[PDB]
From a paper:
The structure of IDE is atypical with a very large catalytic chamber, called ‘crypt', formed by two joining N- and C-terminal domains. The zinc ion is located in the N-terminal domain, but key residues forming the hydrolytic site are located in both domains, resulting in constitution of the catalytic site only in the closed state. IDE has two substrate binding sites, one at the catalytic cleft and the other at the exosite that is distal away from the catalytic cleft. All of these results are consistent with the recognized role of IDE as major protease acting in the degradation of insulin and Aβ.
Numbering used by the authors: 43 to 968, 980 to 1011
The structure:
């Protein structure tokens, strides 16, 4: 009945468990829309996906569509204030982000449910009347450059662009998508191009209503949501832009049967096998790509990976279809290489073609397709409820590909087995259509080519016909069998009825010396799933570097063993996580409760009776060595956070102390360690979900019983159960720790102002203050000053202590960033005194909403509880108490907090700074005016540093 609405979609198919309400519709201008009504959501959300990406970039301005995406946040004609959008969301419990792919640019936000319209209106202007301020463009060009700079020494990006560079140079697929200062500023200036106009023009030419999809989620009715969205988005202009397509494959025969030898930054060994294939998106209802990927990428018994692992050539394998763009795709088989595998690359690839041959001989298996269909059906029915911001964004993306009534189910539900399509794709998987890339340090100095954008050192060879012919003649290897029927597929979806004595929070229902068991029956979600969380305490886990290493190798060897067995369970919605910690071991099993007890016993039982294979020990141990070394190639700001963690923690083995001790880890020594580790334990657990109290106690009983039976485990004392402390900085102190990043040519810095031990008061001062300066900090340090792409502020919580932290990755020297952060703090001081009481109450409200936002899924709630448990604070009612206190804070309260704890001349300022110098930088100790800074005490040695200071107390439990 509305002229602006071309059609209103029918019943939108959803899971019976989904209580959200849906109406799909298509606007007169062509915008596809999905309206989502959820009366309980504390945060509303919307997203818009344009069906243009960097593949549509002008060939002379690489990264333009990406740059466009940055600029839309920087002002519209209706809301011309540069950070009006960001500031609004921040003051209303909201957030926003975006991304640019080959074919899509995706924008999304969430906000307090009370302010959907205000946010939605400002959001809409991106597509109505963007400003593209000349000043803003010249600044933000730097943020894009920074973002690229961060990727240059990253192995994943280097390889990503290299494949693009080794195909047809005239194909859009070869374009550089990110852009940098050269492509965006330097070269355009040479050519005389007005980049601001090219931005305006690109938005004008491609950001058309016929290529847009919109999703909006709020508390409002589907009716009110309809009027709101139509009111705002029917005014979007339709230029009837043809949807871009790329029918010709980027890989022609000149690019097939080619071998590439590549040199990585990190010490890694990879083999990448690629086949060009047709666009399989139209066959989505049968999805031939996923069927083949599922088998080739199978990790269970009989699989290709199983064989390659037995010969000790590979450890992990990825197989399946890989996105390209409209018109083309790829099929890939990727493995990591052992030192041995690197020598048998030709043989590995033969094995791949033998398995593929095994599939041709067997023919398509309908029961396999039928199994994938069945698993996905269950997956969609009992799908966890998504957080709004990610939901609207994801759906906005696939609205382009599917009918309105089917968007929710399209990517889950399979219709009909099409063996013809399977044979079609399988026919492309031949030696004559293969591309091979080997990534190894062993090719260093032996390369002759250099990729233009990342500087990747590589070498190109043609695969000799002698080798190609060998691969085409692939005899059936007897080691290869099709996967067996997945026996972990859940059958019992019964939701057990809430017990009479069921608690709203976890209740302590068992307290022996052996174990402490926390339990809660789910009363919010009612899906047939449960989370089993176990912390195993033992002093021998982190007593020294040698033992810390062995704790790690033990679990890694344990998982390496269970993989083939647990893989089926993972496919069937039943996963486990097993990590070594500073307190001992951490075990988490999550998923459908049905066959969950089966898996859990297998782990605990495997744990306590583990027999170590020597070959796996050698391989896994060597990988760990490279793993520790590879930390040198991490980002400067990641180093910054790592170094600070070491400085401020009572005990912390550095990655150097670890890799040194590793040389002393032997098989005999490790075999001895495991039993010693399991001989003494204390188990603390949280069982949460679709389980009864007796089933919970039964579960706990089985873990203890299995340990005692196989490992002869015994309890640990209460006094032995004290956690580590945080170093306590002196009043008016300032320490600086300086290191260099050998790989990246950006500097990193973390600045930590340590306030005080955690408590309701200190928590809310810090959080309310962080809330107030969150947006302004991003706007000043990045948007205005453009110090870096990565600019972060917020609370730091470790060992029961807390403080305010700033993190920045930049091309400027760390000492420069210091004055700028300090300059900002003085700036913020004035802004808060000038702040109106109403603006202040907005921040109190924004923080309050964020804290009280309820978990949409079980594991989110489980995390909340488990956080209170491992922190041994046990404050399960924390949010209500702290939000209550928050609302009683004064603007004067925050000013005093700042002046006492954080201000430059503050009495109780405890400041430590970590400086990470860029690769080619050098040493130096020490716009809005930056204050004078005292001379810092330069930390020369972490041990001396810790020993010379007090340690905080630990927070007492509830
Ligand atoms: O790079 C991108 C995505 C990103 C880059 C980014 C975004 C946030 C980051 C946060 C911490 C460290 C690093 C970050 C890098 N992007 C965001 C925007 C708009 N900014 C906000 O909405 C915004 C965020 C936070 C605030 F407090 C206030 C406002 N434009 N591009 N697209 O190409
Ligand atoms: Zn970006």
């Amino acid at each position: 009945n509305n002229p602006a609405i071309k059609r209103i979609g029918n019943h939108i198919t959803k899971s019976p468990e989904d209580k959200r309400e849906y109406r799909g519709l298509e606007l007169a201008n062509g915008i596809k829309v999905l309206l989502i009504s959820d009366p309980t959501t504390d945060k509303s959300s919307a997203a818009l996906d344009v069906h243009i990406g960097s593949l549509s970039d002008p060939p002379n301005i690489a990264g333009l569509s990406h740059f466009l995406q940055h600029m839309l946040f920087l002002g519209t004609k209706k809301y011309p204030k540069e950070n009006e959008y960001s500031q609004f969301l921040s003051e209303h419990a909201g957030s926003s982000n975006a991304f640019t792919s080959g074919e899509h640019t995706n924008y999304y936000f969430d906000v307090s449910h009370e302010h959907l319209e205000g946010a939605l209106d400002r959001f809409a202007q991106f597509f109505l009347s963007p400003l593209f301020d000349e000043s803003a463009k010249d600044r933000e060009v730097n943020a894009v450059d920074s973002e690229h700079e961060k990727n240059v020494m990253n192995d994943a990006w280097r390889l990503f662009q290299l494949e693009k560079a080794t195909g047809n140079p005239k194909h859009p697929f070869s374009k550089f998508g990110t852009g940098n200062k050269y492509t965006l500023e330097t070269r355009p200036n040479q050519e005389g191009i007005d980049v601001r106009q090219e931005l305006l023009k690109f938005h004008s030419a491609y950001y058309s209503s016929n290529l847009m999809a919109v999703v909006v989620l709020g508390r409002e009715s589907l009716d009110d949501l309809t009027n709101l969205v139509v009111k705002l988005f029917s005014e979007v202009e339709n230029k009837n832009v043809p949807l871009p397509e790329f029918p010709e494959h980027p890989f022609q025969e000149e690019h097939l049967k080619q071998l590439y030898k590549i040199v990585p930054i990190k010490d890694i060994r990879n083999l990448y096998v690629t086949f060009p294939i047709p666009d399989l998106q139209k066959y989505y209802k049968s999805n031939p790509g996923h069927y083949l990927g599922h088998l080739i990428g199978h990790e269970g018994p009989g699989s290709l990976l199983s064989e390659l692992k037995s010969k000790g050539w590979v450890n992990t394998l990825v197989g399946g279809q890989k996105e390209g763009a409209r018109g083309f795709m790829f099929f890939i088989i990727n493995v990591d290489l052992t030192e041995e595998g690197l020598l048998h690359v030709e043989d590995i690839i033969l094995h791949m073609f033998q398995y593929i041959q095994k599939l041709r001989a067997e023919g398509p298996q309908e029961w396999v397709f039928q199994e994938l269909k069945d698993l996905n059906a269950v997956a969609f029915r009992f799908k966890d409820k998504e957080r709004p911001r990610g939901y609207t964004s994801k759906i906005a993306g696939i609205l382009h590909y599917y009918p309105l009534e089917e968007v929710l189910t399209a990517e889950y539900l399979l219709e009909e087995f099409r063996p013809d399509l399977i044979e079609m794709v399988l026919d492309k998987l031949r030696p004559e259509n293969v591309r091979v890339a080997i990534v190894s340090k062993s090719f260093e100095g032996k390369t002759d080519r250099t990729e233009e954008w990342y500087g990747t050192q590589y070498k190109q060879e043609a695969i000799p016909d002698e080798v190609i012919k060998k691969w085409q003649n692939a005899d059936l290897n007897g080691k290869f069998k099709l996967p067996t029927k997945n026996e972990f597929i859940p059958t019992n979806f019964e939701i057990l009825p809430l017990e009479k004595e069921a608690t709203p929070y976890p209740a302590l229902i068992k307290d022996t010396a052996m174990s402490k068991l926390w339990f809660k029956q789910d009363d919010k979600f009612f899906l047939p799933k449960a989370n089993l969380n176990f912390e195993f305490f033992s002093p021998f886990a982190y007593v020294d570097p040698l033992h810390s290493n062995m704790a790690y190798l033990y679990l890694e060897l344990l998982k390496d063993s269970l993989n083939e067995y647990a893989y089926a369970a993972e496919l069937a919605g039943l996963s486990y996580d097993l990590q070594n910690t500073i307190y001992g071991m951490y075990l988490s099993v999550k998923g459908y409760n049905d066959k969950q007890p089966i898996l859990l016993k297998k782990i605990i039982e495997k744990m306590a009776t583990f027999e170590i294979d020597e070959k796996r020990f050698e391989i896994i141990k060597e990988a760990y060595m490279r793993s520790l070394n590879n930390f040198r190639a991490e980002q400067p700001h990641q180093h910054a956070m790592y170094y600070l963690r070491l400085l401020m923690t009572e005990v912390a083995w550095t990655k150097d102390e670890l890799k040194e001790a590793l040389d002393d880890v032997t098989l005999p020594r490790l075999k001895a360690f495991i039993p010693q580790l399991l001989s003494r334990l204390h188990i603390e657990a949280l069982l949460h979900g679709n389980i009864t109290k007796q089933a919970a106690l039964g579960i706990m009983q089985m873990v203890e019983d299995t340990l005692i039976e196989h490992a002869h485990t015994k309890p640990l004392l209460p006094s032995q159960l004290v956690r580590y402390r945080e170093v306590q900085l002196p009043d008016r102190g300032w320490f600086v720790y300086q290191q260099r990043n050998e790989v990246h040519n950006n500097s990193g810095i973390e600045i930590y102002y340590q306030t005080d031990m955690q408590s309701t008061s200190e928590n809310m001062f810090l959080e309310l203050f962080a809330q107030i300066i969150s947006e302004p900090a991003f706007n000043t340090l990045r948007t205005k000053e453009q110090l870096g792409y990565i600019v972060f502020s917020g609370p730091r919580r470790a060992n029961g202590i807390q403080g305010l932290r700033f993190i920045i990755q930049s091309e400027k020297p760390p000492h420069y960033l210091e004055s700028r952060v300090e300059a900002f703090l003085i700036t913020m001081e004035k802004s808060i005194e000038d702040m109106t009481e109403e603006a202040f109450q907005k921040h109190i409200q924004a923080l309050a909403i964020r804290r009280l936002d309820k978990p949409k899924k079980l594991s989110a709630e489980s995390a909340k509880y488990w956080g209170e448990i491992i922190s041994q604070q046990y404050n399960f009612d924390r949010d209500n108490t702290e939000v209550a206190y928050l609302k009683t804070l004064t603007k004067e309260d925050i000013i005093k907090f700042y002046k006492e704890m954080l201000a430059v001349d503050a009495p109780r300022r405890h400041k430590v700074s970590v400086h990470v110098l860029a690769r080619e930088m050098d040493s130096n100790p020490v716009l809005s005016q930056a204050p004078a800074l005292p001379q810092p005490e330069v930390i020369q040695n972490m041990t001396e540093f810790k020993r010379g200071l007090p340690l905080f107390p630990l927070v007492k439990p509830h």
